[PDB]
Write an enzyme that holds these catalytic residues in place. Structure first.
Site: not given
Ligand SMILES: N=C(N)c1ccc(C[C@H]2CCCC[C@H](Cc3ccc(C(=N)N)cc3)C2=O)cc1
Ligand SMILES: [Ca+2]
Length: 223
Positions: A40, A57, A84, A175, A177-178
């Site tokens: 994603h 920096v 993913d 943020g 993510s990944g």
């Molecule tokens: N049904 C699903 N599998 C599903 C549900 C919601 C989302 C949205 C979204 C919102 C868009 C950005 C990607 C993302 C990033 C993220 C990563 C970790 C955490 C956490 N550990 N609290 C929260 C958010 C996400 O889960 C994506 C997929």
């Molecule tokens: Ca740096």
């Protein structure tokens, strides 16, 4: 990372920052030429930044390398986030040293209760917005699928696992993510998704890396 602590410059040498004019996702270095991240996080025109602590920096230990190829898992499903995972190849091999190193892939999956280290430059607030400039760390245990599903009502697949705290307060966030989820010295997970951040009964969901080792190895060998 919500409820975490400052890791300390280069204490997580395998952590990378994916940059497209700004930081937008984390990733993990698996060898001098490849990085693993979440599908994603896919985007064209990615620059991989290694050896980073403060992403705003230039501190001296960074290595900025453009990606030459991106490979999203053939079965990635953006609706459920199943599979993913994505691989990124660097245009030139990174120079490995004490501040820039690779993380080992799993020889076997991890079990519930195992403690892991999650890291990232994501949001640090459960309510509101506050992005850190330095890398943040969080120790979190892998939760049993049963405890995770019954509390969150989340739709999880065999290619995912939850980690964190059901009481909320500590979690990964947008943020992050990944980014890597390292347990017992192995990369067992990738920050994938969740609902909000650090909410009660809403733990983080992570891609289960041990299920993709074969795919990763074959892909890097053939590309
Ligand atoms: N049904 C699903 N599998 C599903 C549900 C919601 C989302 C949205 C979204 C919102 C868009 C950005 C990607 C993302 C990033 C993220 C990563 C970790 C955490 C956490 N550990 N609290 C929260 C958010 C996400 O889960 C994506 C997929
Ligand atoms: Ca740096």
């Amino acid at each position: 990372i919500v409820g975490g602590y400052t890791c300390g410059a280069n204490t997580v040498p395998y952590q990378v920052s994916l940059n497209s004019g700004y930081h937008f996702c984390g990733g993990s270095l698996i060898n001098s030429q490849w990085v693993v991240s979440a599908a994603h996080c896919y985007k064209s025109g990615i620059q991989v930044r290694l050896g980073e602590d403060n992403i705003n920096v230039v501190e001296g230990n960074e290595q900025f390398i453009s990606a030459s190829k991106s490979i999203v898992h053939p079965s990635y499903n953006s609706e459920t986030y199943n599979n993913d995972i994505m691989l990124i190849k660097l245009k030139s091999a990174a120079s490995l040293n004490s501040r820039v190193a690779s993380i080992s892939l799993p020889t076997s999956c991890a079990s519930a209760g195992t403690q892991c280290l999650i890291s990232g430059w994501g949001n640090t607030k459960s309510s509101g917005t506050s992005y850190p400039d330095v890398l943040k760390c969080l120790k979190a245990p892998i939760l049993s699928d049963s405890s995770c599903k019954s509390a969150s009502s989340f739709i999880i697949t065999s290619n995912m696992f939850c980690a964190g705290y059901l009481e909320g307060g500590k979690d990964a966030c947008q943020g992050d993510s990944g980014g890597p989820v390292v347990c017992s010295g192995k990369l067992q997970g990738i920050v994938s998704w969740g609902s909000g951040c650090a909410q009660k009964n809403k733990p983080g969901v992570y891609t289960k890396v041990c299920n993709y080792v074969s795919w990763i190895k074959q892909t890097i060998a053939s590309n």
